[PDB]
Amino acid sequence: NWTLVWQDEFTNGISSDWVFETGNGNSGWGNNELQYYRRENATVENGNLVITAKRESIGGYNYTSTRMKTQGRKSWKYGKVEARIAMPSFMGSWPAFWMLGDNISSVGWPACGAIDIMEHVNTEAQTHGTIHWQDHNNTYANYSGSIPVSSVTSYHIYTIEWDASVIKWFVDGNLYHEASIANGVNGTSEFHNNFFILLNMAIGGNWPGFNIDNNAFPARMLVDYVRVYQK
Ligand SMILES: [Ca+2]
């Protein structure tokens, strides 16, 4: 059965297991994103993390938001990883709940692997689940599924179950995507290493595009909790 091994319920502030990124990264966090991440865009209100994207200027960028991670504090190999999230829906928005391989520090992205547990862009009536990696031929690979979500602005539960055979994605317990990692099929060896968790909300970028609804700011993503279980 599933045993809880880590959580942040945000009940008494943000856990010291999170580190915050600052700035626009390299080439907009690799995606030509437009935001500058800060600590100040993360707050807690009534037992929920609140990530607020703002029209705010700093360092040559014109929007701010938060990107937080458990890198260097907490990581896991296999498990059930879940968060209860309510996110905004507007043109330019790109919230995510995801994981990266701890070995990113030595192998870089995308060789480290990423497991996107929840992504949403713009005003789509659906959310996506995806894995990204470098395959047997060392070519960038991704494998993505999606599920209709009529109200991303309401709380939904975004989950993966990950074991040495498979990763499965669920929203509200409804299975919608799955990917085999058994034997490192399609060069998925790196999903058999420890990964850390990230939460963020980007503004603009190659996927959502550069048509930004400037009247949708400030915008809030609320996260009731993040939990990890293992067998
Ligand atoms: Ca909570």
C-alpha 221 – ligand 1 centre gap (Å)? 13
Beta bridge partner(s), residue 162:
79, 167
Q: How far is the CA of 155 from the centre of ligand 1 (A)?
A: 12
DSSP letter, residue 205: B
Give Cα separations from 44 to 6, 48, 127, 203, 231 (angstroms): 19, 5, 24, 21, 31
CA atoms of 225 and 15, how far apart (whole Å): 11
Backbone φ, ψ for residue 214 (5° rounding): -70, -10
φ and ψ of 101, to 5 deg: -70, 135
Q: Name the experimental technique.
A: X-ray
CA of 7 from ligand 1 middle (Å) equals 10
DSSP 8-state class, residue 57: -
Q: What is the resolution of this structure in A?
A: 1.7
CA of 11 to the centre of ligand 1 (A): 5
Cα atoms in the 13 Å half-sphere on the side-chain side of 171: 25
Q: Ligand 1 centre and the CA of 66: distance in Å?
A: 18
Q: Which fold has domain 1-231?
A: Jelly Rolls (2.60.120)
| Nearest CA-CA partner of 113 in 201, 194, 178, 180 | 194
